[PDB]
């Protein structure tokens, strides 16, 4: 047995679990995309749908972490939302990447005339 390699070192890394499942992902983007492929669920749609504000978005995340509902439900929701609680604001998990994700980026100023003219065809 010439080959002799034994090591149990640790590398400081960050990982964020999934909302629906318990899958870890190096970064947030990874998860979101994963859900859009498997759970066929988009997080961006929510922010725009329930106009989740800076804090709102946070509640939406933790909400799934605590409640742990199903995609089907995610689509079938109404006001008051099941995440309209402060308690949710708190990070259900530790060093939650998703929570860090800049939701603002999602907000796009519809000022530029970019392809301005719906139903042009």
**In terms of Cα–Cα distance, which of 40, 41, 53 is closest to 107?**
53
Does 64 help bind Zn ion (rule: CB under 5 A)? no
Whole-number minimum distance, CB 2 to Zn ion, in Å? 42
Tokens linked to 24 = 């870890």
Contacts (Cβ under 8 Å, ≥6 apart) of 100? 28
Q: Alpha carbon 46 to chain centroid distance?
A: 10
Sole window of 15-23, 64-72, 81-89, 96-104 interacting with Zn ion (rule: CB under 5 A):
15-23
Q: Which of 16, 18, 25, 46 binds Zn ion (CB under 5 A)?
A: 18
Does 97 help bind Zn ion (rule: CB under 5 A)? no
In terms of CB distance, is 18 or 64 closer to Zn ion? 18
Sole window of 20-28, 45-53, 82-90, 94-102 interacting with Zn ion (rule: CB under 5 A):
20-28
CA–CA gap between residue 118 and residue 121 (Å, rounded): 8
**In terms of Cα–Cα distance, which of 103, 93, 99 is closest to 22?**
93
Binding mask 22-41 toward Zn ion (x if CB under 5 A, else -) reads -x------------------
């Amino acid at each position: 047995g010439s080959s002799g390699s034994s090591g149990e070192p640790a590398h400081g890394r960050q990982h964020t679990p999934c909302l629906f499942c318990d899958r870890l992902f190096a970064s947030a983007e990874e998860t979101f995309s994963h859900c859009k492929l498997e759970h066929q669920f988009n997080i961006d749609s929510m922010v725009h749908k329930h106009g989740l504000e800076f804090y709102g978005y946070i509640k939406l995340i933790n909400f799934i972490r605590l409640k742990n509902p199903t995609v089907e439900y995610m689509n079938s929701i109404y006001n008051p939302v099941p995440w309209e609680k402060d308690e949710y604001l708190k990070p259900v998990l530790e060093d939650d990447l998703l929570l860090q994700f800049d939701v603002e980026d999602l907000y796009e100023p519809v000022s530029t005339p970019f392809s301005s003219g719906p139903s042009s065809g």
